[PDB]
Design an enzyme around this catalytic site. Structure first.
Site, PDB file in Angstrom:
ATOM      1  N   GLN A   5     -14.063 -12.990  -1.071  1.00  0.00           N
ATOM      2  CA  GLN A   5     -14.651 -14.316  -1.156  1.00  0.00           C
ATOM      3  C   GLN A   5     -13.845 -15.271  -2.015  1.00  0.00           C
ATOM      4  OE1 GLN A   5     -18.514 -13.223  -3.218  1.00  0.00           O
ATOM      5  NE2 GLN A   5     -18.014 -15.076  -4.390  1.00  0.00           N
ATOM      6  N   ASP A  40      10.202   4.564  -9.631  1.00  0.00           N
ATOM      7  CA  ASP A  40       9.228   3.887  -8.782  1.00  0.00           C
ATOM      8  C   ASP A  40       8.900   2.502  -9.335  1.00  0.00           C
ATOM      9  OD1 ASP A  40       7.425   3.366  -6.796  1.00  0.00           O
ATOM     10  OD2 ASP A  40       5.931   4.841  -7.446  1.00  0.00           O
ATOM     11  N   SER A  50      -1.845   1.450  -6.943  1.00  0.00           N
ATOM     12  CA  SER A  50      -0.400   1.598  -7.030  1.00  0.00           C
ATOM     13  C   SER A  50       0.296   0.279  -7.313  1.00  0.00           C
ATOM     14  CB  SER A  50       0.156   2.173  -5.720  1.00  0.00           C
ATOM     15  OG  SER A  50      -0.326   3.479  -5.475  1.00  0.00           O
ATOM     16  N   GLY A  51       1.329   0.340  -8.147  1.00  0.00           N
ATOM     17  CA  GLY A  51       2.094  -0.844  -8.492  1.00  0.00           C
ATOM     18  C   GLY A  51       1.435  -1.680  -9.567  1.00  0.00           C
ATOM     19  N   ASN A  55     -12.410 -11.399  -6.514  1.00  0.00           N
ATOM     20  CA  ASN A  55     -13.148 -10.792  -5.412  1.00  0.00           C
ATOM     21  C   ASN A  55     -12.283 -10.955  -4.165  1.00  0.00           C
ATOM     22  OD1 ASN A  55     -14.918 -10.542  -3.045  1.00  0.00           O
ATOM     23  ND2 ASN A  55     -16.607 -10.521  -4.530  1.00  0.00           N
ATOM     24  N   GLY A  60      -4.266   2.215  -3.750  1.00  0.00           N
ATOM     25  CA  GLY A  60      -4.610   0.805  -3.793  1.00  0.00           C
ATOM     26  C   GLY A  60      -4.369   0.235  -5.177  1.00  0.00           C
TER      27      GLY A  60
HETATM   28 CA   LIG Z   1     -11.186 -14.131  -4.023  1.00  0.00          CA
END
Ligand SMILES: [Ca+2]
Length: 240
Positions: free
Chosen positions: A64, A93, A188-189, A61, A186
């Protein structure tokens, strides 16, 4: 990941979150795969900009404390020599990040398994994409790690006129395209985990999706084919 579901916490232990510093805070920008205690594999376009990066392993997460995280800085960035930021369709890439310190391997942090050089998967092979990327085209990042079943689409089919055409090269892997599930900004990679000989191995590094959107029918998510870079990867880690 569009059309995915929350992954069991720490069920994909080689998945890392690549973040950059913006002011006095950090922001997730890409995914990556831990391949050595001090090396991470990600996309070259993720480290194109000159920002301060940090890697987070054992994450679940993003907002948190999960009580399983380890934060480490990036000491060196090695981008593939042929990478051209203005032509993602040309391939190459991929980038390797040497971490400032070796992370501790445990229940939540493990090394990703890489395929043998040259390995090509048959059409419709079982794979899963994971990441904290957007959950909808032009949407927002996921707070918890997401996963989606994303079977492969072989080169012959993916490079046909009905799909990506000549935009895709043999040095790439296509997966998905069902119009419901896909990778997105997001992710990506990040890795594409594929089941081979009883074990999940990282066969792809998330590279790009259509400009029309993330989940587009017959526009599978495209990944850098890891098996085409095994020699390069080994040469970098052995001389750095
Ligand atoms: Ca976390």
């Amino acid at each position: 990941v569009v059309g995915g579901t929350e992954a069991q916490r720490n069920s994909w232990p080689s998945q890392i979150s690549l973040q950059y510093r913006s002011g006095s805070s950090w922001a997730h920008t890409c995914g990556g795969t831990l391949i050595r205690q001090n090396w991470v594999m990600t996309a070259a376009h993720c480290v194109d900009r000159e920002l301060t990066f940090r890697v987070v392993v054992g994450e679940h997460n993003l907002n948190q404390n999960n009580g399983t995280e380890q934060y480490v800085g990036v000491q060196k960035i090695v981008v593939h020599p042929y990478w051209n930021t203005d032509d993602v369709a040309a391939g190459y890439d991929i980038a390797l990040l040497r971490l400032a310190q070796s992370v501790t391997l445990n229940s939540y942090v493990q090394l990703g398994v890489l395929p043998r050089a040259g390995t090509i998967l048959a059409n419709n092979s079982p794979c899963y994409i994971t990441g904290w990327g957007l959950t909808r085209t032009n949407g927002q990042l996921a707070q918890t790690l997401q996963q989606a079943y994303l079977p492969t689409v072989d080169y012959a089919i993916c490079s046909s006129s009905s799909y990506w055409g000549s935009t895709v090269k043999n040095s790439m892997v296509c997966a998905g395209g069902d119009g419901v599930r896909s990778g997105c900004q997001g992710d990506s990679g990040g890795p594409l985990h594929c089941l081979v000989n009883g074990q999940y191995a990282v066969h792809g590094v998330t590279s790009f999706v259509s400009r029309l959107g993330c989940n587009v029918t017959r526009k599978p998510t495209v990944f850098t084919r890891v098996s085409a870079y095994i020699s390069w990867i080994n040469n970098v880690i052995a001389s750095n």
